[PDB]
Amino acid sequence: QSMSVKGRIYSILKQIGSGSSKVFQVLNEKKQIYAIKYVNLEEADNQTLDSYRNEIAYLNKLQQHSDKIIRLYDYEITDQYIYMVMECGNIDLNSWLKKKKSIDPWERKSYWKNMLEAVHTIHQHGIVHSDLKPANFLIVDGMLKLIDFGIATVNYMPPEAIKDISPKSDVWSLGCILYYMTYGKTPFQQIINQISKLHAIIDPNHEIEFPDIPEKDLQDVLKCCLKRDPKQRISIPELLAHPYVQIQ
Ligand SMILES: CN(C)C(=O)c1ccc(Nc2cc3c(cn2)cc(-c2cnn(C)c2)n3C(=O)OC(C)(C)C)c(Cl)c1
């Protein structure tokens, strides 16, 4: 029905998502829209508690560094609950890609720069996500914004994570997300048996297909991102200077 976060009252309009936490589309006293995430802490161990405090801390610090990280306006933390007041975005990248059959080569490129800016910011603060998927990015006024940092599907899993993990592990993952926006399928979507899928990702003999596309610069980015040897894989600062990201 309604909720209070640091003196301010908010009215629920819809529930966006939901284990111990629930996300809502809310309204303040000035009828301004936000997204409040309520976390129930009643049955949470110290390890869980610290992980939650660590993502809020990072979310707080990184606000000041990039507009490609979701706005955290305010928050209320007690022993029983967490209330996080954030900006409301239109739709997450995953749901957006499920609905949208095709993708505009310009909208894709714009969303790509956004993902690199967001993931580059977290790298600059010693964070490696490791579990990057489209469900982690949000569309906020024609801009992709990173929703979480991995502190609190297997098609996006880097080969090095399975062989046993660095900022290059997030490169593989982003590379898979762009491969999806380019080819409508992730590189190992064709394999259903999850065990066999994990083998294909780490097997260098399993030569990933890259069909001929009109955007030669885009095909190159995907080849550079999806190199099984992390030492051979392209970095984010290099990706940021690629002709695909920088040229019209
Ligand atoms: C399929 N879905 C549920 C949608 O079409 C959809 C997706 C996203 C939407 N907006 C939205 C979702 C949001 C936020 C802000 N706006 C903030 C968050 C959030 C939670 N934790 N952290 C660190 C950020 N958030 C969120 O978690 O969204 C999902 C439930 C979709 C994953 C809205 Cl209003 C609808």
To test ligand 1's pocket by mutation, which of 147, 148, 151 has the most ligand atoms within 8 angstroms of CB? Answer: 147
Of the candidates 64, 104, 70, 101, which has an alpha carbon nearest to the alpha carbon of residue 85?
70
Ligand 1 site residues, Cβ closer than 6 angstroms:
16-17, 23, 25, 35, 37, 70, 86, 88-89, 91-92, 95, 135, 138, 147-148
Which residue intervals of 144-242 are DSSP H helices?
159-162, 167-183, 194-202, 216-225, 236-239
**Could you tell me which residues come within 8 angstroms of residue 239 by beta carbon, excluding any fewer than 6 positions away?**
116, 171, 221, 224, 225, 245
Which H helix or E strand runs over 56?
helix 46-63
The answer to whether 97 and 180 are in contact (CB under 8 A) is yes
Chain centroid to CA 200: 24
> Which experimental method was this entry solved with?
X-ray
Sequence-ordered strand ranges (E) for 72-117: 72-77, 81-87, 91-92
Of the candidates 128, 124, 107, which has an alpha carbon nearest to the alpha carbon of residue 174?
128
The CA distance from 246 to 248, in Å, is: 7
Q: Provide the 10 A C-beta neighbour count for residue 101.
A: 7
Q: Return the residue whose CA atom lies nearest to atom 18 of ligand 1.
A: 147
What domains sit in the chain, N to C, each tagged with a CATH number? 3-90 (3.30.200.20), 91-248 (1.10.510.10)
Q: Which two tokens stand for residue 85?
A: 């007041």
**Could you tell me which residues come within 8 angstroms of residue 238 by beta carbon, excluding any fewer than 6 positions away?**
none
The SS3 assignment for 50 reads helix
The CA distance from 82 to 188, in Å, is: 38
- Long-range contact set of residues 59-68: C-beta below 8 Å, sequence gap at least 24: 59/84, 59/149, 61/125, 62/121, 62/122, 62/125, 65/121, 65/124, 65/125, 66/117, 66/118, 66/121, 67/143, 67/145, 68/114, 68/117, 68/118, 68/121, 68/143, 68/144, 68/145, 68/146
User: What's the 207 CA to ligand 1 centre distance in angstroms?
Assistant: 36
Query: C-alpha distances in angstroms, 92 versus 10, 70, 89, 122?
Result: 22, 12, 8, 19
User: What's the 220 CA to ligand 1 centre distance in angstroms?
Assistant: 32
Q: Which two tokens stand for residue 191?
A: 């394999």
Check if 131 is active-site.
yes
Q: How many helical (H) and strand (E) elements, i.e. helices and strands, does the chain have?
A: 9, 9
